[PDB]
Design an enzyme around this catalytic site. Structure first.
Site, short mmCIF file in Angstrom:
data_model
loop_
_atom_site.label_atom_id
_atom_site.label_comp_id
_atom_site.label_asym_id
_atom_site.label_seq_id
_atom_site.Cartn_x
_atom_site.Cartn_y
_atom_site.Cartn_z
N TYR A 27 0.80 -1.23 0.00
CA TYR A 27 0.00 0.00 0.00
C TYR A 27 0.83 1.27 0.00
O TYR A 27 0.29 2.36 -0.19
CB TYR A 27 -0.96 -0.02 1.22
N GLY A 29 2.72 3.90 -1.37
CA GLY A 29 3.11 4.52 -2.59
C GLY A 29 2.47 4.05 -3.89
O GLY A 29 2.44 4.79 -4.83
N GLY A 31 -0.48 0.89 -5.33
CA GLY A 31 -1.25 -0.31 -5.15
C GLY A 31 -2.44 -0.13 -4.27
O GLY A 31 -2.49 0.70 -3.43
N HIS A 47 -3.83 5.36 5.31
CA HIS A 47 -3.67 6.66 4.67
C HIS A 47 -4.33 6.66 3.30
O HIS A 47 -4.93 7.64 2.89
CB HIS A 47 -2.14 6.87 4.54
N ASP A 48 -4.25 5.55 2.59
CA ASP A 48 -4.92 5.45 1.28
C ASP A 48 -6.44 5.58 1.53
O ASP A 48 -7.11 6.24 0.79
CB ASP A 48 -4.69 4.12 0.63
N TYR A 51 -7.29 9.26 2.21
CA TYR A 51 -7.36 10.06 1.00
C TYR A 51 -8.64 9.66 0.30
O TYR A 51 -9.25 10.51 -0.35
CB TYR A 51 -6.18 9.74 0.08
N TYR A 64 -1.08 22.15 2.25
CA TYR A 64 -1.69 22.62 3.48
C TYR A 64 -0.62 23.28 4.33
O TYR A 64 0.60 23.11 4.09
CB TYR A 64 -2.36 21.42 4.26
N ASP A 89 -2.23 13.06 6.46
CA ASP A 89 -0.79 12.95 6.36
C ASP A 89 -0.15 12.95 7.74
O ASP A 89 0.74 12.12 7.98
CB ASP A 89 -0.27 14.14 5.58
#
Lengths: 121, 5
Positions: A27, A29, A31, A47-48, A51, A64, A89
């Site tokens: 996951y 970066g 995929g 985190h994915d 987002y 930000y 993030d």
């Protein structure tokens, strides 16, 4: 933004985001499939999903503002997308710091065919 | 370094 998140990761962990987290596990970066390989990879899965919660924001490019208060990451008020992207993030950088103890180089450049199945956010 | 992820 991606570069900003990279700097946050470096400041947090002392690892450069590329190459340490840019192709790690299933996951980090790239995929979207498979079971996360370890806690660090889980940070990237979450985190994915974070987002993914923001389909009308643009986390790669939108900058930000945040500050460090002593060590604490404090997201400063911008647009709603920037606030939300920042909290995503911030969480991933903290998650990476919390799991540096199990980070394993063996998962860098992890190949796609070892990542199979949808895991729901 | 430290863009991505």
């Amino acid at each position: 933004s991606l570069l900003e998140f990279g700097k946050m990761i470096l400041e947090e962990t002392g690892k450069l985001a590329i190459p340490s987290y840019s192709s790690y596990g299933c996951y980090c970066g790239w995929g979207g499939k498979g079971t996360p390989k370890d806690a660090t990879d889980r940070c990237c899965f979450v985190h994915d999903c974070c987002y993914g919660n923001l389909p009308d924001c643009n986390p790669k490019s939108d900058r930000y503002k945040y500050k460090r208060v002593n060590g604490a990451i404090v997201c400063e008020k911008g647009t709603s997308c920037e606030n939300r992207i920042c909290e995503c993030d911030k969480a991933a950088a903290i998650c990476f710091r919390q799991n540096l103890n199990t980070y394993s180089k063996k998962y860098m450049l992890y190949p796609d065919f070892l990542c199979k199945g949808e895991l729901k956010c | 370094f430290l863009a991505y992820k």
